Design an enzyme around this catalytic site. Structure first.
Site, PDB file in Angstrom:
ATOM      1  N   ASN D 278       0.880  -1.199   0.000  1.00  0.00           N
ATOM      2  CA  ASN D 278       0.000   0.000   0.000  1.00  0.00           C
ATOM      3  C   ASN D 278       0.909   1.238   0.000  1.00  0.00           C
ATOM      4  O   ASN D 278       0.880   2.010   0.982  1.00  0.00           O
ATOM      5  CB  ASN D 278      -0.999  -0.063   1.164  1.00  0.00           C
ATOM      6  CG  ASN D 278      -2.216   0.824   0.990  1.00  0.00           C
ATOM      7  OD1 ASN D 278      -2.394   1.464  -0.043  1.00  0.00           O
ATOM      8  ND2 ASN D 278      -3.062   0.876   2.007  1.00  0.00           N
ATOM      9  N   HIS D 282       1.534   4.706   2.503  1.00  0.00           N
ATOM     10  CA  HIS D 282       2.948   4.739   2.964  1.00  0.00           C
ATOM     11  C   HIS D 282       3.581   6.087   2.594  1.00  0.00           C
ATOM     12  O   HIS D 282       4.161   6.706   3.493  1.00  0.00           O
ATOM     13  CB  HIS D 282       3.765   3.567   2.402  1.00  0.00           C
ATOM     14  CG  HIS D 282       5.234   3.822   2.438  1.00  0.00           C
ATOM     15  ND1 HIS D 282       5.927   3.968   3.623  1.00  0.00           N
ATOM     16  CD2 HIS D 282       6.133   4.011   1.447  1.00  0.00           C
ATOM     17  CE1 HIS D 282       7.194   4.212   3.360  1.00  0.00           C
ATOM     18  NE2 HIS D 282       7.348   4.235   2.031  1.00  0.00           N
ATOM     19  N   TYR D 290       7.355  11.783   8.505  1.00  0.00           N
ATOM     20  CA  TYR D 290       8.838  11.610   8.471  1.00  0.00           C
ATOM     21  C   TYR D 290       9.549  12.756   7.724  1.00  0.00           C
ATOM     22  O   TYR D 290      10.792  12.680   7.634  1.00  0.00           O
ATOM     23  CB  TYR D 290       9.226  10.239   7.898  1.00  0.00           C
ATOM     24  CG  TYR D 290      10.691   9.896   8.008  1.00  0.00           C
ATOM     25  CD1 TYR D 290      11.374  10.056   9.204  1.00  0.00           C
ATOM     26  CD2 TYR D 290      11.407   9.424   6.917  1.00  0.00           C
ATOM     27  CE1 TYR D 290      12.723   9.755   9.314  1.00  0.00           C
ATOM     28  CE2 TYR D 290      12.757   9.116   7.012  1.00  0.00           C
ATOM     29  CZ  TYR D 290      13.420   9.286   8.215  1.00  0.00           C
ATOM     30  OH  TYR D 290      14.746   8.980   8.319  1.00  0.00           O
ATOM     31  N   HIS D 317      -5.042   1.674  11.845  1.00  0.00           N
ATOM     32  CA  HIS D 317      -5.597   0.356  11.419  1.00  0.00           C
ATOM     33  C   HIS D 317      -6.395  -0.290  12.561  1.00  0.00           C
ATOM     34  O   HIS D 317      -7.494  -0.829  12.283  1.00  0.00           O
ATOM     35  CB  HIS D 317      -4.490  -0.575  10.897  1.00  0.00           C
ATOM     36  CG  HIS D 317      -4.077  -0.294   9.491  1.00  0.00           C
ATOM     37  ND1 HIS D 317      -4.899  -0.568   8.414  1.00  0.00           N
ATOM     38  CD2 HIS D 317      -2.940   0.221   8.977  1.00  0.00           C
ATOM     39  CE1 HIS D 317      -4.286  -0.228   7.299  1.00  0.00           C
ATOM     40  NE2 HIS D 317      -3.081   0.259   7.617  1.00  0.00           N
TER      41      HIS D 317
HETATM   42  C1  LIG Z   1     -11.009  -7.075  11.232  1.00  0.00           C
HETATM   43  C2  LIG Z   1     -10.901  -6.595   9.746  1.00  0.00           C
HETATM   44  O1  LIG Z   1     -11.710  -5.856   9.297  1.00  0.00           O
HETATM   45  O2  LIG Z   1      -9.817  -7.036   8.946  1.00  0.00           O
HETATM   46  C3  LIG Z   1     -10.145  -7.766   7.734  1.00  0.00           C
HETATM   47  C4  LIG Z   1      -8.877  -8.550   7.376  1.00  0.00           C
HETATM   48  C5  LIG Z   1      -9.033  -9.182   6.030  1.00  0.00           C
HETATM   49  C6  LIG Z   1      -7.648  -7.503   7.334  1.00  0.00           C
HETATM   50  C7  LIG Z   1      -7.692  -6.595   6.221  1.00  0.00           C
HETATM   51  C8  LIG Z   1      -6.633  -5.404   6.375  1.00  0.00           C
HETATM   52  O3  LIG Z   1      -6.662  -4.573   5.297  1.00  0.00           O
HETATM   53  C9  LIG Z   1      -6.549  -3.197   5.625  1.00  0.00           C
HETATM   54  C10 LIG Z   1      -7.748  -2.463   6.261  1.00  0.00           C
HETATM   55  O4  LIG Z   1      -5.547  -2.620   5.416  1.00  0.00           O
HETATM   56  C11 LIG Z   1      -5.138  -5.937   6.669  1.00  0.00           C
HETATM   57  C12 LIG Z   1      -4.564  -6.475   5.353  1.00  0.00           C
HETATM   58  O5  LIG Z   1      -4.236  -4.728   7.072  1.00  0.00           O
HETATM   59  C13 LIG Z   1      -3.202  -5.013   8.128  1.00  0.00           C
HETATM   60  C14 LIG Z   1      -2.427  -3.935   8.776  1.00  0.00           C
HETATM   61  C15 LIG Z   1      -1.080  -4.252   9.539  1.00  0.00           C
HETATM   62  C16 LIG Z   1      -0.157  -3.097  10.006  1.00  0.00           C
HETATM   63  C17 LIG Z   1       0.535  -2.338   9.077  1.00  0.00           C
HETATM   64  C18 LIG Z   1       1.343  -1.322   9.540  1.00  0.00           C
HETATM   65  C19 LIG Z   1       1.431  -1.102  10.921  1.00  0.00           C
HETATM   66  N1  LIG Z   1       0.765  -1.836  11.783  1.00  0.00           N
HETATM   67  C20 LIG Z   1      -0.012  -2.810  11.364  1.00  0.00           C
HETATM   68  O6  LIG Z   1      -0.586  -5.689   9.616  1.00  0.00           O
HETATM   69  C21 LIG Z   1      -1.261  -6.757   8.802  1.00  0.00           C
HETATM   70  O7  LIG Z   1      -0.716  -7.783   8.610  1.00  0.00           O
HETATM   71  C22 LIG Z   1      -2.649  -6.505   8.223  1.00  0.00           C
HETATM   72  C23 LIG Z   1      -3.575  -7.558   8.012  1.00  0.00           C
HETATM   73  O8  LIG Z   1      -2.993  -8.437   7.065  1.00  0.00           O
HETATM   74  C24 LIG Z   1      -5.104  -6.989   7.654  1.00  0.00           C
HETATM   75  C25 LIG Z   1      -6.185  -8.145   7.451  1.00  0.00           C
HETATM   76  C26 LIG Z   1      -5.892  -8.888   6.091  1.00  0.00           C
HETATM   77  C27 LIG Z   1      -6.110  -9.206   8.542  1.00  0.00           C
HETATM   78  C28 LIG Z   1      -7.281 -10.319   8.405  1.00  0.00           C
HETATM   79  C29 LIG Z   1      -8.728  -9.666   8.457  1.00  0.00           C
HETATM   80  O9  LIG Z   1      -9.712 -10.657   8.320  1.00  0.00           O
HETATM   81  C30 LIG Z   1     -10.533 -10.896   9.476  1.00  0.00           C
HETATM   82  C31 LIG Z   1     -11.895 -11.528   9.284  1.00  0.00           C
HETATM   83  O10 LIG Z   1     -10.176 -10.620  10.582  1.00  0.00           O
HETATM   84  C1  LIG Z   2      -5.089   3.313   6.527  1.00  0.00           C
HETATM   85  C2  LIG Z   2      -6.378   3.538   5.772  1.00  0.00           C
HETATM   86  C3  LIG Z   2      -6.230   3.161   4.304  1.00  0.00           C
HETATM   87  C4  LIG Z   2      -6.976   4.155   3.429  1.00  0.00           C
HETATM   88  C5  LIG Z   2      -7.074   3.649   1.998  1.00  0.00           C
HETATM   89  C6  LIG Z   2      -7.207   4.829   1.054  1.00  0.00           C
HETATM   90  C7  LIG Z   2      -7.450   4.394  -0.388  1.00  0.00           C
HETATM   91  C8  LIG Z   2      -6.655   5.220  -1.396  1.00  0.00           C
HETATM   92  C9  LIG Z   2      -7.007   6.684  -1.238  1.00  0.00           C
HETATM   93  C10 LIG Z   2      -7.298   7.519  -2.229  1.00  0.00           C
HETATM   94  C11 LIG Z   2      -7.320   7.148  -3.687  1.00  0.00           C
HETATM   95  C12 LIG Z   2      -8.627   6.455  -4.068  1.00  0.00           C
HETATM   96  C13 LIG Z   2      -9.335   7.173  -5.215  1.00  0.00           C
HETATM   97  C14 LIG Z   2     -10.333   6.295  -5.958  1.00  0.00           C
HETATM   98  C15 LIG Z   2     -11.558   5.924  -5.128  1.00  0.00           C
HETATM   99  C16 LIG Z   2     -12.756   6.847  -5.303  1.00  0.00           C
HETATM  100  C17 LIG Z   2     -13.993   6.129  -4.757  1.00  0.00           C
HETATM  101  C18 LIG Z   2     -15.144   7.050  -4.414  1.00  0.00           C
HETATM  102  O1  LIG Z   2     -14.977   8.286  -4.360  1.00  0.00           O
HETATM  103  O2  LIG Z   2     -16.249   6.521  -4.178  1.00  0.00           O
END
Ligand SMILES: CC(=O)OC[C@@]1(C)[C@@H]2C[C@H](OC(C)=O)[C@@]3(C)Oc4cc(-c5cccnc5)oc(=O)c4[C@H](O)[C@@H]3[C@@]2(C)CC[C@@H]1OC(C)=O
Ligand SMILES: CCCCCCCC/C=C\CCCCCCCC(=O)O
Ligand SMILES: CC(=O)OC[C@@]1(C)[C@@H]2C[C@H](OC(C)=O)[C@@]3(C)Oc4cc(-c5cccnc5)oc(=O)c4[C@H](O)[C@@H]3[C@@]2(C)CC[C@@H]1OC(C)=O
Ligand SMILES: CC(=O)OC[C@@]1(C)[C@@H]2C[C@H](OC(C)=O)[C@@]3(C)Oc4cc(-c5cccnc5)oc(=O)c4[C@H](O)[C@@H]3[C@@]2(C)CC[C@@H]1OC(C)=O
Ligand SMILES: CC(=O)OC[C@@]1(C)[C@@H]2C[C@H](OC(C)=O)[C@@]3(C)Oc4cc(-c5cccnc5)oc(=O)c4[C@H](O)[C@@H]3[C@@]2(C)CC[C@@H]1OC(C)=O
Ligand SMILES: CC(C)CCC[C@@H](C)[C@H]1CC[C@H]2[C@@H]3CC=C4C[C@@H](O)CC[C@]4(C)[C@H]3CC[C@]12C
Ligand SMILES: CC(C)CCC[C@@H](C)[C@H]1CC[C@H]2[C@@H]3CC=C4C[C@@H](O)CC[C@]4(C)[C@H]3CC[C@]12C
Ligand SMILES: CC(C)CCC[C@@H](C)[C@H]1CC[C@H]2[C@@H]3CC=C4C[C@@H](O)CC[C@]4(C)[C@H]3CC[C@]12C
Ligand SMILES: CC(C)CCC[C@@H](C)[C@H]1CC[C@H]2[C@@H]3CC=C4C[C@@H](O)CC[C@]4(C)[C@H]3CC[C@]12C
Ligand SMILES: CC(C)CCC[C@@H](C)[C@H]1CC[C@H]2[C@@H]3CC=C4C[C@@H](O)CC[C@]4(C)[C@H]3CC[C@]12C
Ligand SMILES: CC(C)CCC[C@@H](C)[C@H]1CC[C@H]2[C@@H]3CC=C4C[C@@H](O)CC[C@]4(C)[C@H]3CC[C@]12C
Ligand SMILES: CC(C)CCC[C@@H](C)[C@H]1CC[C@H]2[C@@H]3CC=C4C[C@@H](O)CC[C@]4(C)[C@H]3CC[C@]12C
Ligand SMILES: CC(C)CCC[C@@H](C)[C@H]1CC[C@H]2[C@@H]3CC=C4C[C@@H](O)CC[C@]4(C)[C@H]3CC[C@]12C
Ligand SMILES: CCCCCCCC/C=C\CCCCCCCC(=O)O
Ligand SMILES: CCCCCCCC/C=C\CCCCCCCC(=O)O
Ligand SMILES: CCCCCCCC/C=C\CCCCCCCC(=O)O
Lengths: 375, 375, 375, 375
Positions: D278, D282, D290, D317
């Site tokens: 992502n 980042h 930073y 998150h």
């Molecule tokens: C509860 C929920 O809604 O999560 C859905 C789910 C899919 C998320 C989606 C999420 O996606 C998002 C919102 O970014 C993601 C991928 O994002 C993070 C963020 C961090 C992190 C990063 C930087 C600093 N600190 C922490 O570490 C990880 O491994 C992950 C995980 O893999 C998760 C998960 C995949 C873990 C498994 C989860 O499934 C369930 C049912 O619990």
């Molecule tokens: C830590 C939280 C992560 C946030 C994820 C943000 C997603 C990326 C952000 C901006 C670019 C997306 C632009 C395209 C989506 C438009 C959708 C809409 O307006 O309905």
């Protein structure tokens, strides 16, 4: 001095091109043909295959225990050397391969109750792999005392019919597959010859030791009766395993200096016999125990080292038998030692020959008595 | 063709200068030394001199019967030739004194009940004198067909180790008295070796034929048990009497062409064995029966003459045994004839060797059975 | 056309030098590391070594039965050819080696009650040795139709990772012992991966088929549940045995043209998949059944020959399974045949992939049901 | 340094032009096709549309709450900047309309009892608008520190797939409507894939936690069972939302520098994974936290800032999940923090991969437990 390898030929092979030795050889195959015809004709009114099928009881287990030891000696010493010569663990790891091909071949031999012949296999493939896993190491360490040999050479070395790690090994042009086929055919014919000698001239005489008397006449005449299977067992051991087996394996691998034995049958004195019989193990033993002995001891006295080497050989052979037949009965070492003492304290070839005959006679007699009084 | 004499040396003697044959020879004397030590140790708790003292019963009579024979063959043939070649009584003289050497050695052998070994002397001496007296005559007669050889030559001829009367006999510089002493020492050591082989490995197995069974298993295993004294008896007969005895007598007399035997141990086929075993009697037999046969018969067919000669040999040998052991049991001739028929109607060296081994085994077995079922 | 050998590299190895495939490979070893950690942590409150120790029951017997077949296929075909091309027996002897590596590996597998995994070994070393003992023969016979290949080549051929006897075999400079060590380490890691997949995701689901219902919901959801071990078993079989095992053996022997598999994962149609999966057996099968078929039949019709070859493959594989699991349950051939009929009578890559997934799912499901309803 | 935009293309798209990745992609669509066929066949004797219809409960309300948000972030930031850069109320306006996008999306989410999936929409949209509204402001303020950017650029910016306000944005020639149609079709296929994974491999295992034991075996084996939906959820989240969604929207808008993600699957260490997963968020986070951290603090110590940024990410998150599932259960942050501490106090890619797998396994396990022990 260090032994240096030439493209000389196994002495008996350079004799066998002479006709009269082709005759003697033919006389001996004729001997086999008489035994097979006579035994076939008697047992008709089946064969003595019983000793073979009995003696090779768990031969499958004996070989799948050969594989772990072979893999241990192949990998452990080389990795030990390669990592140890990189500045470690190596001082330990070498220990494990001390304990895996030292503990395993006893545990699978005693705890599973193997027969004699299917056990000797493992006995011989733990006093091979120490002899090399150590030869290789002590050869290639002083190269690293400089303030890593090619692996392919070490693999080739583990199967090469010498115990000295020289990593040159003068080689021959090509593989005479006719010659190796002939040599294996002779080696297997030799095993069958030994099978007949045991099943015809040892078992019948020695079976009836349950007999009460233990009269000294009976025992001494049993010794004379058994001296001849003794000599044929020696000649067969020698011929098959030192001319047929190691030539066959020295022809598949294209090895030179096939002097695995000098003419021991000409050895005037006894020491000469021991130096010129099984010259491969002698040369390993000679080199390491008599050029680390006289180096570390630095002793002006050498006679000590001569007997030193020979009791190392005797103790090793006593251990081999103590393992195979499952006894603790050390007859050979007492004989070798006592007459060693006799001749070294207190036409000449004939005396050696006569004492060798009685040496064989005593060993075969007492070992048959011990195997049929422990059963 | 007529045989012509060279200054070649007895094949085994030209081999014995090679070291490996000195070794084999030493192994065999070591064999004797083991037998003497073991038998001395067993009979202590005397020796097997009994077979010697028994077998040479009336040896004094056997020799004082040898003297009349020797004088008859020395005088009668020569006087007959000398007077017969003077124009008489010769035609009667020889025919009248061919009966002394034919009648006397039977009369003193049967009517006085001699043992076997003290009898065989006179057997060999009557056939020997018949052979070489007739040789002498048929050689020196065609010299007189011209429309008297030197006596000293005939005296020398009677003791010379050949049966052909050539009266040239290529001779050697001097008498190596060390060599003849060695050869006689070996010949007497050989007799002692045969004494042990009989008294240790034949008498014990064959004594108990009074046993009822006559089971074919018992007989056939007795044949296999007895095949080895058979081969050592042959090798001893050969070595002592064809290398030791005739070389000793060919060194006292300074004789050349000491090829009394070619290498029969290399004979591919059987006929070759018979032509190259006891070459002296073969050459006499060959010359007279195969160059008077093909002369008088003049037969384009020669195979008839080959078998002709060989049945003459077989019949002579059968007669020798029929005389010595006092039987009429002709086993050898039946064996030779039957397998003669077998191979001549219906690496190859080995088959010959195996059949020779069983030939020896059958002959020794059946002759021991016959000697201990006629006593 | 006849297949001709180049110094090309195993396709996956020339991909693995790209970084992203090193990543995928790493993801899969990470998968193994998770399984070992999780199973170690569960079984703590030992391992699933039980499937290994059970499945390799008489592995000693399985290998000492491998030796006779190996010696038969090494000697019998060559001697057959060498003597048959000398003008005999050869027309028979070839028969025995038909009957020794056809009868023995069944007799030791059924009469001794071997497990599945220790049996498959022998299964595979009787459909290897026929494939070669026949390839070799039919290659080197038309050389003799001229009105004897070097043996060393035939020995080398028996171990070479191809089934075509070409006796040229383009070779590589030297032996990268680091590379072969890596390949064997991967192959053994792969066996351990398969051990976990079975002992964790097959046994638990399939153990409870003693259950009465046999409801079609239960069976179909068992098929979906089991489709994933199906695909990982296929990928593991493929990766280990077609990239790790044959590369390891193609590096010890210095073999070229290591295209044992083309990219089957790109095969648009099904025939392409079958041609480009296990290309070694395909090429043997292709060459012999599709260039003796179209030669002897000489048939303008080739589609017959396409299905001909493929039912030969199917029948061989059905036989392999019918032998290993000791059933007569021929599910695979019915599946292959029926959908063969379906597509050949009545982006495109995806349909192939989906049908392969369900192919795997059905085979694993029904074979687990049959193994746990026959026990 | 400030990030500068090039006309590079999304890394996976430049990979997908290679054939082998078209294959992997096809394997995954085949996976979907097996799931749809098997589930259709099982539910026949309707679908798992229930999770979709349940999870998108008040989706109408979720979108008519999205509109006020979008209008607030569109107007308030710009009007504030334009009037504030005219010398006022801006300082109050933004601070007063930073609460609409902070208060409203909680009030409509909690007081109306929305499901999870229809709530996450507003969660992402409030954090998204906070992020890029603040970005816009802090970019265009230092332009006014000089003692008004074009609005059309700000409108375009709110929809542009980056969070950095650069008002240049290197653009592409034209709109490949075929490509965007394909990308949306994939994104919707991906949502359906996630629907099946949840409804088939998560709900069944996790439904029965009403079960009393709470045995550590049961929990740990549930974690291992659930690690695989964990990884497929991650891969789907990644693929759909970072390759399909943002490329689709970067093709409708004709955007360049589509490096929304570097190859995180090659990240040797963990920090690299977080910097290359992502990359859009980042880069926003990197730039502001930073290059305002190391500016305002001016701290020679930077490691503080590395962990500073990462706990900002973790807290954000944790907040997102604490909102969506309506818990206060902060598992992820504890896991990230603790192993952060572990590796930063106390071939290498594999360890990262294994720990990522268990990270996913723990998060999915404990969140399913918490969602089915709070219901
Ligand atoms: C509860 C929920 O809604 O999560 C859905 C789910 C899919 C998320 C989606 C999420 O996606 C998002 C919102 O970014 C993601 C991928 O994002 C993070 C963020 C961090 C992190 C990063 C930087 C600093 N600190 C922490 O570490 C990880 O491994 C992950 C995980 O893999 C998760 C998960 C995949 C873990 C498994 C989860 O499934 C369930 C049912 O619990
Ligand atoms: C830590 C939280 C992560 C946030 C994820 C943000 C997603 C990326 C952000 C901006 C670019 C997306 C632009 C395209 C989506 C438009 C959708 C809409 O307006 O309905
Ligand atoms: C008990 C056993 O297994 O031996 C088998 C047998 C054949 C061995 C084979 C053995 O072969 C091996 C393993 O080396 C061999 C030949 O090796 C030695 C070694 C030494 C020796 C050498 C140096 C220093 N000290 C002692 O002395 C000997 O005479 C001999 C013997 O001849 C033996 C024997 C022949 C003696 C007769 C034996 O038969 C029986 C049934 O007892
Ligand atoms: C009964 C006797 O006195 O013989 C003693 C014995 C040793 C002889 C010595 C004999 O020696 C003599 C007189 O020449 C010898 C060697 O001579 C012949 C002759 C022929 C032959 C040759 C040509 C044509 N026809 C037949 O075939 C043979 O194999 C042999 C044998 O081997 C024998 C024997 C060895 C066989 C074993 C015998 O032992 C016993 C106890 O029976
Ligand atoms: C019962 C058994 O031992 O098979 C083990 C297993 C892994 C095999 C290994 C086998 O490997 C061998 C021996 O080749 C393999 C891969 O080989 C074939 C051959 C053909 C085929 C080819 C040409 C013509 N006709 C039919 O069809 C297939 O899909 C496959 C399958 O995928 C299988 C399987 C993977 C199917 C799943 C199986 O697992 C179980 C427990 O049943
Ligand atoms: C294949 C079967 C028949 C085994 C054959 C064993 C024979 C051929 C071998 C084994 C031991 C060997 C003998 C041992 C040593 C000697 C002493 C030497 O001064 C002459 C050769 C001789 C006598 C050898 C000849 C060949 C030999 C006899
Ligand atoms: C006569 C009857 C008892 C048969 C005897 C079988 C035994 C004694 C024979 C047959 C085959 C022989 C083995 C074959 C080859 C080897 C490998 C070598 O590295 C050590 C010796 C060893 C292991 C031999 C030792 C003796 C041996 C085991
Ligand atoms: C004096 C006592 C010990 C008798 C000695 C007998 C020995 C020395 C004699 C008798 C018979 C002879 C053997 C008979 C024939 C052969 C076969 C030939 O291919 C090698 C030599 C060999 C093996 C002879 C060697 C010497 C020999 C063994
Ligand atoms: C082993 C026991 C029986 C001893 C055997 C003694 C006999 C068989 C031996 C010993 C001495 C030998 C004899 C000595 C020399 C001659 C003179 C010769 O012109 C004819 C053979 C003849 C007569 C020999 C025949 C065999 C012989 C008689
Ligand atoms: C040693 C243990 C971990 C076994 C490892 C198995 C892995 C490394 C092997 C086995 C099967 C192989 C896969 C089978 C075929 C494909 C499809 C292709 O389009 C991409 C590569 C890919 C995905 C291969 C990558 C390597 C692979 C995944
Ligand atoms: C997962 C559990 C059941 C372990 C399975 C072990 C079996 C299936 C594996 C392990 C080692 C493999 C064998 C090792 C190598 C060979 C030699 C080759 O010429 C034929 C295939 C064969 C014989 C392999 C077949 C499959 C095999 C036997
Ligand atoms: C539309 C449906 C089928 C979803 C498809 C998901 C597939 C096509 C996507 C999602 C996640 C992606 C994978 C995630 C990362 C990697 C690791 C890399 O080393 C090889 C490519 C690979 C394996 C990607 C290939 C494409 C991928 C598998
Ligand atoms: C598998 C089942 C639960 C379906 C899950 C539906 C949810 C999780 C999926 C489907 C559509 C996705 C949304 C569609 C696009 C956007 C707009 C973006 O600016 C924020 C993320 C957001 C809001 C996505 C978040 C995840 C999402 C809401
Ligand atoms: C005192 C103990 C005697 C040990 C005898 C050792 C034999 C000679 C040693 C090494 C050379 C042999 C190499 C050829 C044999 C390979 C057979 C195998 O590995 O199974
Ligand atoms: C078939 C019968 C075999 C006959 C063997 C004959 C032996 C050789 C014949 C003559 C040469 C012998 C001469 C030397 C021995 C003289 C002994 C003596 O006169 O006492
Ligand atoms: C349809 C049956 C499939 C048979 C698979 C055959 C495997 C490939 C055949 C030959 C090349 C293998 C050579 C290397 C293996 C040597 C192993 C051994 O001999 O134990």
């Amino acid at each position: 001095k260090q032994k240096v390898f030439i493209i000389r030929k196994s002495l008996l092979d350079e004799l066998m091109e002479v006709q009269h030795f082709r005759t003697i050889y033919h006389m001996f195959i004729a001997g086999l043909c008489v035994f097979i015809i006579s035994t076939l004709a008697i047992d008709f009114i089946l064969l003595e295959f019983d000793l073979l099928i009995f003696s090779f009881g768990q031969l499958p287990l004996a070989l799948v225990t050969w594989v772990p030891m072979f893999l241990s000696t192949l990998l452990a010493p080389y990795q030990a050397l390669r990592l140890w010569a990189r500045g470690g663990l190596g001082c330990a790891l070498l220990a494990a391969h001390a304990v895996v091909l030292c503990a395993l071949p006893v545990h699978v031999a005693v705890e599973h109750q193997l027969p004699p012949a299917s056990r000797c296999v493992l006995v011989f493939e733990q006093v091979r792999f120490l002899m090399k896993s150590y030869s290789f190491l002590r050869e290639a360490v002083p190269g690293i005392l400089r303030a890593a040999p090619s692996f392919s050479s070490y693999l080739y070395f583990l199967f090469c019919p010498t115990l000295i790690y020289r990593e040159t090994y003068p080689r021959t042009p090509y593989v005479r597959w006719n010659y190796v086929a002939k040599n294996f055919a002779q080696a297997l014919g030799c095993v069958l010859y030994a099978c007949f000698i045991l099943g015809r001239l040892c078992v019948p005489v020695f079976a009836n030791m349950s007999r009460e008397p233990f009269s000294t006449r009976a025992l001494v005449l049993s010794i004379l009766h058994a001296t001849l299977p003794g000599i044929f067992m020696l000649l067969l051991i020698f011929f098959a395993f030192l001319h047929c087996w190691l030539n066959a394996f020295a022809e598949m691998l294209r090895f030179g200096d096939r002097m695995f034995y000098r003419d021991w049958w000409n050895s005037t004195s006894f020491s000469n016999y021991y130096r010129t019989w099984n010259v491969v193990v002698h040369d390993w033993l000679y080199s390491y125990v008599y050029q680390d002995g006289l180096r570390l001891l630095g002793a002006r006295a050498r006679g000590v080292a001569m007997l030193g080497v020979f009791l190392v050989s005797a103790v090793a052979h006593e251990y081999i038998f103590c393992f195979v037949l499952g006894f603790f009965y050390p007859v050979m070492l007492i004989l070798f030692l006592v007459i060693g003492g006799m001749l070294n304290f207190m036409a000449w070839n004939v005396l050696m020959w006569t004492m060798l005959f009685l040496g064989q006679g005593i060993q075969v007699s007492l070992y048959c008595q011990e195997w049929y009084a422990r059963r």
